DNA sequence: TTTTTTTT
């Protein structure tokens, strides 16, 4: 008898795992019968209830060997190994249909027969999204886009307002549904230089929290941020390959992300001023607030933190030709399911009701 | 024959340690015989004669191996990992569930047959801790929710107050029924860094004495707590997964828990004013500050900063149907308990004897 | 069996892979039978199809492997050495011969059988370059010359102007054609080793813009950046050997290599000039905008940003007689696979459409 | 045969060693004939003698083999891992009483057949320290309960005093008898990270010299330490756990010690002073200065720096009741050996002596 | 056939070898033909040419090995251990006693038929030596002995003259008689913890150079260093342990050792001047310039600052009572060679020459 | 290999 470090592989590789102690808390599961495993009955995870049975025996060998993590930090190297290779391989608009694919996977099990949430919230969600501002699912679509054609130094939207006033709100959600990073620029310089080197193959990224000086004007109090934005005007641009930081490894060197920053008002270089592709003003908007001290369930299950919000809203809106190609294939099926339990009256009966500023509901 | 890594492993997991030291001294110690062992004639640790009879066999050939390390670091690692897949895959209500289970063990034993500490003298705490504020029991109420739904940017309360008011006490209370860590800020920016990294994979954390500036107007000498936190905005409203390191370590990326700052009474700005739920005064009562004088087995034993007397308090004082459904059971049994072992009239006339600044008892 | 170690080299050089991450996830793709491979089929990546029927037998026993990082780490080693080799050895023609050699593959690319481009858009580009003065297919020429024919002073290039001068656009293409690394200075002078040691064993070295003092009557910040070029005499005019620290790391020693120096306008300490082969003045031209305003394809596809573009700059100006022999006449081919294209009448009317900024593809 | 491991872990174990570098060293003085050892013969060093015939034929085999180091690195673990269990699991009382036992150990081979100190030097030394201070013998006692009861923030005591005040000599002769470390605060405030990292596991610590702030008319240097001790405040209370730093190692987390601060007549702000339970203000002492300039011999052989001087003391003043039952077995045959080798006419004598500030011999 | 690794460790230990490299080295030579060795026959080194002999048929088959950095490591490893026993077991005087047996061993190579230098001229020193101040011979015994009692406060000498007055060729001379290291103590106070640093189990330290407070009314050039000491009194004093620091290490606990201080005629404090036991005044005397002027070899040697000729003095000077009696045989063989080598009236020519301002030979 | 250091 001796593991099978490929079936470790395998499993790693379908779980999509890339944390070393994950995998190995994860695989250590399997030693016992799956037969009477509640975690199976209950359906309780499906990283462990697809698998249990598939990897019990070799998994009981595992549970004995004496090189179990060695063994996992193989099967972990094979999957940072396919993302970089993809990372480089892919293209951007094939990139974003692979991770629409995982989400859509996602809401299979979130509204399955275990459908342990349920679409009602999901859809005040989407409703209470699309009054935040015009053409809602358009300028979605548009930013969309615009981080597939990535056209150089038209890389950054930004968004400025007031605090509360929801532009992380809207930020935080993008991520989610790309897949990305967000990180912090405040920090020094040193600090920060290895910060970026999260960087590496995320599609995406955001910073939050981040200070110009003399914002005092304004009230607000204020800090370097804008300093550490100017230091990497070649990161913003996109213009070049740069490098990135590492831990135990080589620093890599490779092309910058796009995305969103957050800001509010203080002091900024117009180099800077003139030079994104977009902006928002994000103002508040009281009757927001009016449901919201209601339909708090909302923010309980970070509803409108999700960017499976988003993908509803989209789904909800644009016509199936407008997606990508193969997907369309499950958007049908997804449209369906939305005629299914919603009439147009339920959405209409929603979003009116909540633009009132009334709770959800009557 | 062989050590057994396994037999290792399984008690590492019985025992939750996940120290190579502590664990490698501890399982040293079982090589002796059982039959005379006197830690277990002495019944001193539980750690340790509930294990010694087990695990004897295999200690013998540990004792000769020449590997010990490195079968001890192996076992470490899976408790690790078992945090990890926790961490990852339990509700919020779960853990501290789990958590609570814990705590009544350790007070079946603190008050079992063995009674190490005197249920009255505990009982006698909890009082003096009820009376520290208004509706104290209905407070912690408010603030086990708090932690448990995590709602984004509804995270963090704020004690403040003078000198010797007991925000401390009631912090360190809170951090030991929840099992958070402690946070020091009032520190260069540099190693800073590394202080955070504390924080990874804990239910919830504490920023202490967090010194602001201009202070010693106010005979308060001022200090960095204020102007650094107001750089770390991203990490308290939690919105965003935010990024985690040690030392030889690469970064983690989640969520920062959520959590309590403390501060001697400071300006505070807009800013992070908007970022606390709660603010709690807390003001000096001279019959407090006599009685502890008196009854010092309170300050002594620690008991008034214990969560097992908060989990006390909330036993005596809640209804059990506001506890999560598995637990309830063990909840009947304390009531029935604490309700036979403690009339309300005893109760009662405690809290007289406190407000009237005696020593607690008669 | 087992697996071959060599066969795994010999990708590497033929691939020239020096990532072994990248290495790993490539080579692992050959497990599957060449045979079937829809990659192959599809013949999207030749670092895939080309090598997929050859290494299959050695993939697939790879693929079993136990060993295989360390498998990687050897053949990574491998293509180090190489370029270490090569590094020292060869003379800074025979190394920009190399180049030239394969950004003619570049071309094979960039024209390759997909009928790749048009290369009308790319003598677009060329042509939007030659507008400071008609002189610059010179200046590219002299500055690869002054390369080759580097003597102490003869070093660094001043690229002096304020924004959209196009200089940091030129010298990323630069850095595209003949390689290098573009660098930062405004810094405490420990802080500006930890910068400098990027600069390691290279050939070549571009940097950014540098705080005067006092120029505030046209804006320009007052800061260090100048009083550290007053301390780099051992680097700017450079005659004698000098070490190049990074960060408590890697303290080489040699002759620091030449290159450009990119600022705003500013002051004068002619302490600085004296050591450079130039001071040479650039200012936008209105015109160029609302030529960029019609030619936008030509930023769209980095065209412009591309040092592919100077590799057609001078073949178009330059006379193959200027080239390195081997080249020459390939040379030839791109003279004739310009006039495949181009009449001087086109390339005229190109120009004369920019003479007004007339959309260039009139 | 071959070398046993457990024998070298016995051999650590007994002699308590803490070092590699020593315990190979001390392990490879055994390989040569025991009995020839002129080491053994001269009686020189027990942690030699004791143990070499024992352990030669181990330490012959040991001699030749491959792997020293190795053997000596898990050694040193167990001693060390034994200290990490029994800093968690014994009673502070238990940990004192066991430093008594080692101290007493070291008084028995000081007075023992060896010969090798006078015990009527050491007993000088006691009335001159029982004049250092009103009822000294009575505030060692109250310090000592103060240290086991560890109770939150009445935790610290203030020393006050001119130069030659005796403060440090005495501070000295309170932390040999407990164990722990001094530790200067007067540092610039990034190098305070790693200067309390010596706090952990100790048992007691002492500030060494607080330089305060203005006080030129005081007549003292100022330094960082009185305002830097305020912003520590923290680390007196003892209330929560605190995290603790050494270089290369990742944070470890503790209570943090109780202790002494001493300084000159500097002002202290009453926000760190209440913090302080106690304060004792030194004089100089004329008689004092006169009897030490007359019974050099008590400084020449450090007596009244000595943690063993204190312990005399102790067993004189002190009814046995005091101390903990195990080690009253060992303190009732001391003061059999004192009272038979002294008399109360003698030690009034002697104390008679330093009134008079004669030498203290008469 | 297999290495002997004992062999190797043993050279080790005889050369006293500390760098792995050096060892490393040294033993590799040994592979060529012994018999022939070209190193060995012209006797240039004596590390190798009483050894190559022996080890050479060891050598050749560690010159195959593949584990030969590692063997060398366990052998350095040996004499590192050995210094380690060395310092925590041995009596002060054994120490001396220890380097005089080194210096005495370099002695009976110096003065040799083939390994030569002149045994007249190193006599020519001792002569000017024992001119620099009354009773020399007498003053290096009593600095001697204050080294090896170590005696609390009586710990410190003071060196007080002008420059060019040989305060520090004397301070050279007694460092090198004893291994100890200097300090320089002028920086300003926070980076003094790695001066201090360097003495860790040093034998003696020189304070150089001391600058006070000023002295510019003396042109004396004025710094702190005066201050810094009257800051370290309980460095001087040794009465009791302090705690030191290196770079990267951790911190070491010890007496901080007895040494010397060097000034021109700053101001003292009177605080300082009860620290010192002794002080020396040294002061330009004009025959030894011209004495100088025509004795040069003295200088082209350095002579005149070698611990061997302060070695030479002593045992020429003081009686053989005054050595420990160990090393008395090898001093009497040293009094014999020079009483056979010099009558007394040549030497005391020699004295009057130097008194003369002559040059010392006629 | 980082970390510590460096410098702050
Ligand atoms: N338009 C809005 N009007 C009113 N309240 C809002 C609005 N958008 C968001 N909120 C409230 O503000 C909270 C925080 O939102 P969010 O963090 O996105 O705001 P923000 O403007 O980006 O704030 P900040 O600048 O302080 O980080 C939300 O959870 C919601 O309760
Ligand atoms: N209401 C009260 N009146 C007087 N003393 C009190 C009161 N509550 C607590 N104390 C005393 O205050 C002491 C310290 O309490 P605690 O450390 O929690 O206060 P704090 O305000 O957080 O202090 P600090 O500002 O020092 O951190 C307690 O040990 C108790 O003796
Ligand atoms: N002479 C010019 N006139 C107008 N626009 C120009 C000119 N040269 C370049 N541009 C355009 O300006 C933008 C920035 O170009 P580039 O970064 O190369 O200029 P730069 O002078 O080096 O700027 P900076 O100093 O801000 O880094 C690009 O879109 C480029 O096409
Ligand atoms: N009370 C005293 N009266 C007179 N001389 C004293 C007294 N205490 C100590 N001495 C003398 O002073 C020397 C140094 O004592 P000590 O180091 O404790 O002084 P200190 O001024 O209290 O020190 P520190 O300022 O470092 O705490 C002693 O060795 C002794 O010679
Ligand atoms: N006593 C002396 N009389 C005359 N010349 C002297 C005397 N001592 C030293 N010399 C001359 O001074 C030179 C330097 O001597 P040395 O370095 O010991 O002097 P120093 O005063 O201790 O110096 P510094 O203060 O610079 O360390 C010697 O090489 C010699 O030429």
């Known amino acids: 008898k001796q593991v099978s470090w490929k079936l470790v592989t395998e499993y790693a590789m379908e779980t999509k795992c890339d944390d070393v102690l994950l995998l190995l808390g994860m695989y250590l599961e399997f030693q016992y019968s799956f037969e009477m495993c509640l975690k199976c009955i209950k359906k309780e995870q499906p990283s462990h209830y697809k698998y249990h049975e598939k990897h019990y025996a070799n ?36 990139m974003l249909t692979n991770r629409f694919n995982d989400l859509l996977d996602r809401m299979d099990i979130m509204f399955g027969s275990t459908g342990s949430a349920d679409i009602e919230e999901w859809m005040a969600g989407v409703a209470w999204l699309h009054c935040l501002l015009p053409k809602m699912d358009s300028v979605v679509y548009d930013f969309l886009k615009c981080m597939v054609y990535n056209i150089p130094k038209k890389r950054y939207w930004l968004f400025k307002g007031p605090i509360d006033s929801g532009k992380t709100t809207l930020a935080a959600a993008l991520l989610e549904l790309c897949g990305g990073k967000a990180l912090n620029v405040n920090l020094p310089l040193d600090r920060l230089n290895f910060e970026l080197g999260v960087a590496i193959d995320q599609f995406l990224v955001v910073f939050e929290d ?23 005007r070649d990161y913003l641009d996109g213009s070049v390959k740069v490098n990135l930081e590492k831990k135990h490894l080589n620093k890599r060197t490779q092309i910058f992300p796009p995305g969103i920053v957050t800001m509010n008002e203080y002091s900024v270089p117009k180099t800077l001023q003139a030079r994104f592709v977009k902006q928002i003003d994000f103002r508040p908007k009281d009757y927001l ?11 309980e299950k970070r509803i409108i933190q999700s960017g499976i919000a988003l993908l509803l ?50």
């Not at 009981?60 to 063994?71: E, G, M, V």
């Not at 981040?210 to 990497?232: A, H, Y």
């Not at 607030?289 to 923010?299: A, D, V």
């Open 59 to 94: 998994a009981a060998i595992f549970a004995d060997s004496k090189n179990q993590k060695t063994i996992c930090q193989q099967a972990v190297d094979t999957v940072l190994a396919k993302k970089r290779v993809d990372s480089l391989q892919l293209t951007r608009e094939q």
């Open 210 to 232: 981040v200070k110009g000086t003399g914002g005092e004007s304004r009230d607000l109090p204020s800090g370097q941020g804008i300093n550490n934005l100017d230091n990497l």
């Open 289 to 299: 607030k009016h449901c919201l001290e209601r339909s708090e369930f909302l923010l």
């Open 313 to 362: 809203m989209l789904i909800w809106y644009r016509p199936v030709a407008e997606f990508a190609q193969s997907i369309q294939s499950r958007i049908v099926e997804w449209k369906e399911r939305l005629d299914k339990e919603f009439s147009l009256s339920v959405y209409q009966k929603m979003k009116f009701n909540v633009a009132m500023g009334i709770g959800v509901l009557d």
